[PDB]
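Hypothesis: this fold can be encoded by more than one sequence.
Test: take the structure tokens below, design a sequence, compare later.
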């Protein structure tokens, strides 16, 4: 009846975004819960919906405690994201897998000397095509951004034929195509 808890390096918060066009974007975001142990992560993951079962327009976000999953956050305003784009068939094939490995990538501190630059990750469930992104705190840190993208792409088994791009939040938020600051 003894249950050991394995600590994580950081405390993490899972966020949920609901699809509702009658409310503003900020009003559709809500905090689910937080955790800082391996056991509490799986407890949360095992009782929430899989990403492939979300209604279109919904998001999941896992960010470090104190960072909100929005581009106006103080830890995100100068940063950016490595973006992955999936087709419709990739949803049943790879969406749930890619998201779980992403979650374990985050909470495992798998980015060597640049783990502190990581802010979180977001998965968007969209009818036009699902997206998964890992957010970093500073888009001008070339060593941090390129290292995080290389580790992330390899840890998710993506073939080298597919090229993933990094984009600044400030550039994305003012888009009137969002150019890539880096490619891996
Ligand atoms: N009323 C109502 N309308 C909604 C709602 N959701 C969509 N629409 C409208 O629906 C139509 C079709 O687009 P869509 O279905 O493709 O939504 P999308 O596919 O999600 O596109 P998006 O990603 O361009 O986001 C679209 C807009 O969402 C707001 N947004 C998104 N992020 C997350 C975010 C963070 C970093 C990088 C990129 C994104 C943030 C953020 O961090 N901080 C703030 N302040 N705003 C953020 C912002 O305004 C953005 O321009 C369009 O007219 C939409 O405006 C809604 O909740 N309510």
């Amino acid at each position: 009846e003894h249950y050991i808890k394995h600590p994580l390096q950081n405390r993490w918060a899972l966020w949920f975004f609901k699809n509702d066009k009658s409310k503003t974007w900020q009003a559709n975001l809500r905090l689910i819960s937080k955790f800082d142990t391996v056991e509490d992560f799986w407890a949360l993951y095992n009782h929430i919906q899989l990403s492939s079962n979300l209604m279109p327009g919904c998001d999941y976000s896992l960010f470090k405690d104190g960072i909100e999953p929005m581009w106006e956050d103080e830890k995100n305003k100068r940063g950016g994201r490595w973006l992955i784009t999936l087709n419709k068939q990739q949803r049943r094939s790879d969406l749930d897998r890619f998201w779980l490995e992403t979650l374990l990538c985050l909470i495992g501190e798998s980015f060597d000397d640049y783990s502190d630059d990581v802010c979180g990750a977001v998965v968007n469930v969209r009818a036009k095509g699902d997206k998964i992104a890992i957010w970093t705190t500073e888009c001008e840190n070339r060593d941090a951004v390129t290292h995080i993208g290389r580790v992330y792409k390899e840890r998710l088994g993506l073939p080298p034929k597919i090229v993933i791009g990094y984009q600044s939040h400030a550039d994305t938020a003012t888009k009137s195509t969002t150019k890539n600051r880096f490619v891996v």
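Residues 82 and 166 are 4 Å apart (CA to CA). The longest helix spans residues 89-107.
Hypothesis status: open.
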